[PDB]
Design a protein around this ligand. Structure first.
Ligand SMILES: NC(=O)c1ccc[n+]([C@@H]2O[C@H](COP(=O)([O-])OP(=O)(O)OC[C@H]3O[C@@H](n4cnc5c(N)ncnc54)[C@H](O)[C@@H]3O)[C@@H](O)[C@H]2O)c1
Ligand SMILES: NC(=O)c1ccc[n+]([C@@H]2O[C@H](COP(=O)([O-])OP(=O)(O)OC[C@H]3O[C@@H](n4cnc5c(N)ncnc54)[C@H](O)[C@@H]3O)[C@@H](O)[C@H]2O)c1
Ligand code: NA
Ligand code: NA
Lengths: 495, 495
């Protein structure tokens, strides 16, 4: 049962000014299952106005962190109450398996749980005295809500990616304007209903669905948006930051990757190593920012590892995401599907081997299904090696030495995550410093915790999500200097 | 004795490729006293190459914080050894009084002293374990040098503004490329000589003089500059950030202000309050970012306060900055001089009173001297009230209530500093939260400490200089997750 909602502005459901709507497409069946509102510039001004009013009123602009946490704990409780419907809708809306969708629903409530406790602790650290080598000055640092924040998010983890920004923004005390992806907005709109259901103060959270240049764009060039927190592709981040530059507006950039997985011959279990290699590149149909999309395996175990990988890979169940025991679903859209398959075909033109998958599963007549693909005979000058595919596609390379492995791992414009599979501690530490990234996985690929800073360097962007970082991004920092002497400054001659 | 240097690149003095030079102008005498090298795009590539090589070599890319601190403590010791020549040159080069120039020389050494100790402590907090609710995962945060950093700085505190970025960049372990203002580059180039004199590793610090679009510009669009730390005017920050957006490059923005000074009738000393009001708007010939350029005085004391202010003001000695007991010098350039006087004249056209100064001092035939100016009969729709003047110009307004005072204080596009002069504690706290800025001064205007976060919000930009913030800006943050279980992931069916 697909819901039909409006834009969530000022605590009420509000229709878009131009009355425009965009379809909801089912990636498993290529059918229109509904429609979402498509906001425009005028809608963004109404939502910024609603956000500014929330910041000026008492039930939001004057709340303690503890008061704000009561609300986040209540949003977590509704997510957990409706886990089954939300997980089904996230699945029907993004193509993600019901299992991953329910797993993202647990993660979402856990994120509000984390930011609830952090909002309660925020009241304590609001005032931080800093000792000085002065008998005339008194100093402290005042932490306060930054104000109006624009939250532009991607479709890969529709609710989860949004929540990474919503949970800390609200914890910090900001009034947010959430703009999710036009490919997966069902759960974000439902978040609006949860907020109505928990009585969240009006304008505290504003959810605006619609096209990126149409609804995301004006938020980036709005003179009353204190900050834009952006997650998505690099070319989009450029456009956003370029617009935010005109208004000297701060913007955070969480972008893509071509993260490497380095496996060395000293692995205790070839079956556990291959299972992590699968999860790092085929979970979420490969549509993961930190996906370990380049496998740099040692020549020694390369022969053994590839056999187990492909055995495990050919075992991945590709079916309808709502089905029982499904391990792989379709990609999000038709445009994504073609781009992904164009990458597989471009690897053929260039001279690479398609050792596994690469074609459409013969049993699924409808939907954007791509077989999990493992490509070999890959050189550094190839687009497959060079660029983020965002499909269940893995390219493979061999090495002999540590130096060779480092060299290959860092031969990328990206710098999000990296995984190092080895039993040698000091080699795992060497890789910890050599990896020109923001995330290092030791003896796994992909698990994260709220308590940790998420982000990259190079073409993967700047800024850190999660941890205390994710909350501090939405805090304005005040220097409070007080002069405590009766004595005059002594600079300037007295009349 | 004016020095004639080259560009400081890779530990050696290197000539600019195009052989171009730009003059050094004396603001007190309007004479060419020398020339500085004017770097171009090709020069920026050589310096980025030098910076990348320093990051790849052992004597810089492998140093401990303690090793880096030995160097900063040595740069501080040379600054203090040559205090007298550097202070004279800063004065001849910027127009700043020898007193303020020597005071900036003390501040500079103190800043390296602060960042030396912070570099020593950096080694300890390099690895930070974060406890988890997991018996299978182990996590910690790795802090490391960010890499190659571009440091674009203004002429108001030539050496001091540069040092605010140089001291933390070098403490953090980055290889910096310093680009100072073409109006005041004498001391920054001399910093190059100090670095030669202390044996600072090659490429660790690269100093590139020259025009902003010519030498600052390519640094902003260079693909191998990890981050741009920018201080200067808003329109410049736009151009820099717009260029950094193409390469999704992080950039910090320390911009201008129209900071208010709120004085209430409950002041214990009218003479101490007026002296701080002078220092906040006439020190450095008003060329201060955080200058308290708008005085919102209470109607009650307005009559009394203005008499003492003007009495103290008419007492300010305007002479040659190298002279004995000089309290005000000339503005930096001819272009600045005209812009500043155009503001004073624009206040006349608009309907304001020029209660004090506004004209050129009758006794100085040469130089860009402007009398300290106090303008009254000022309304909110006036450019004088609205925009940063960057001259010794103060505009004045009266109020009756707290609400009226807050309203006037925040009626600006800026948001750098703010000063509140009152004996009422809870009123000083109310103003602490109401002031829509990044710096609050209680019972003073302008003093800062290294230990404090410097920066603003709104049109004054984003990011924080100084404190641990200033060092963390130059640290890449790594998430280190390690899987410690023998058990398989359980996601994906085993073959
Ligand atoms: N670094 C991270 O933490 C992280 C997390 C998740 C996804 N990602 C990256 O996100 C990408 C997938 O997301 P996507 O396909 O939604 O990216 P995208 O760039 O197409 O769009 C992301 C969001 O920006 C909006 N948008 C598009 N054009 C815009 C414009 N002109 N102005 C303003 N907003 C605009 C979209 O509507 C959407 O909400 C991949 O590259 C992936 O690696 C990164
Ligand atoms: N917020 C702070 O902490 C702080 C501190 C000091 C000064 N300031 C602000 O700085 C301003 C005074 O400085 P200014 O006159 O040197 O400012 P500016 O904008 O004219 O230039 C600053 C620097 O940028 C360079 N630059 C100019 N155009 C450039 C371009 N196209 N690309 C790259 N670099 C370019 C200049 O050569 C110089 O080094 C005032 O507005 C003042 O309030 C702010
Ligand atoms: Na869709
Ligand atoms: Na000059």
């Amino acid at each position: 049962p697909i819901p039909r909602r409006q834009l969530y502005i000022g605590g009420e459901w509000r229709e878009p000014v131009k009355k425009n709507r965009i379809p909801i497409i089912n990636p498993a069946t290529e059918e229109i299952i509904g429609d979402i509102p498509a906001a425009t510039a005028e809608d963004v001004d109404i939502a910024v106005e609603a956000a500014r009013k929330a910041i000026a009123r008492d039930d939001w602009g004057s709340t303690t962190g503890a008061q704000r946490a009561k609300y986040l704990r209540a949003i977590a409780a509704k997510v957990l109450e409706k886990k089954s419907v939300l997980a089904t809708l996230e699945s029907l809306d993004s193509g993600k398996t019901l299992y991953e969708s329910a797993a993202d629903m647990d993660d979402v409530a856990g994120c509000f749980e984390y930011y609830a406790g952090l909002a309660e602790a925020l009241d304590s650290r609001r005032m931080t005295p800093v000792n000085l080598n002065s008998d005339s000055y008194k100093s402290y640092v005042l932490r306060e809500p930054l104000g109006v924040v624009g939250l532009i998010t991607p479709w890969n983890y529709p609710l989860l990616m949004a929540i990474w920004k919503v949970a800390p923004a609200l914890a910090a005390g900001c009034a947010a304007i959430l703009k999710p992806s036009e490919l997966a907005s069902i759960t974000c709109l439902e978040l609006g209903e949860i907020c109505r259901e928990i009585g969240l103060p009006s304008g505290a959270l504003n959810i605006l669905t619609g096209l990126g240049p149409e609804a995301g764009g004006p938020l980036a060039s709005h003179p009353h948006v204190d900050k834009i927190s952006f997650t998505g592709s690099g070319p989009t981040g450029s456009k956003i930051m370029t617009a935010a530059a005109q208004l000297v507006k701060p913007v955070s950039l969480a972008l893509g990757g071509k993260s490497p997985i380095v496996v060395f011959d000293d692995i205790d279990n070839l079956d556990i190593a291959a299972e992590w290699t699968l999860f790092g590149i085929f979970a979420n149909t490969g549509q993961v920012c930190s996906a370990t999309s380049r496998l740099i395996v040692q020549e020694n175990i390369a022969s053994a590892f590839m056999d187990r990988l492909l055995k495990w890979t050919k075992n991945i169940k590709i079916s309808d995401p709502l089905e029982e025991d499904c391990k792989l679903g379709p990609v999000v859209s038709a445009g994504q599907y073609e781009k992904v398959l164009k990458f597989i075909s471009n690897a053929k033109s260039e001279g690479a081997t398609i050792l596994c998958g690469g074609e459409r599963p013969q049993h699924l007549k409808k939907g954007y299904y791509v077989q999990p693909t493992i490509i070999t005979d890959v050189n550094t000058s190839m687009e497959i090696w060079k660029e983020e595919v965002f499909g269940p596609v893995l390219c493979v390379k061999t090495f002999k030495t540590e130096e060779q492995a480092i060299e290959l791992a860092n031969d990328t414009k990206y710098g999000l995550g990296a995984a190092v599979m080895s039993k040698d501690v000091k080699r795992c530490e060497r890789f910890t410093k050599a990896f020109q990234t923001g995330i290092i996985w030791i003896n796994c690929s992909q698990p994260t915790f709220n308590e940790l800073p998420w982000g990259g360097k190079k073409r993967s962007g700047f800024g850190r999500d999660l941890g205390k970082w994710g909350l501090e991004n939405f805090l304005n920092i005040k220097q409070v200097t007080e002069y405590t002497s009766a004595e005059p400054l002594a600079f300037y001659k007295s009349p």
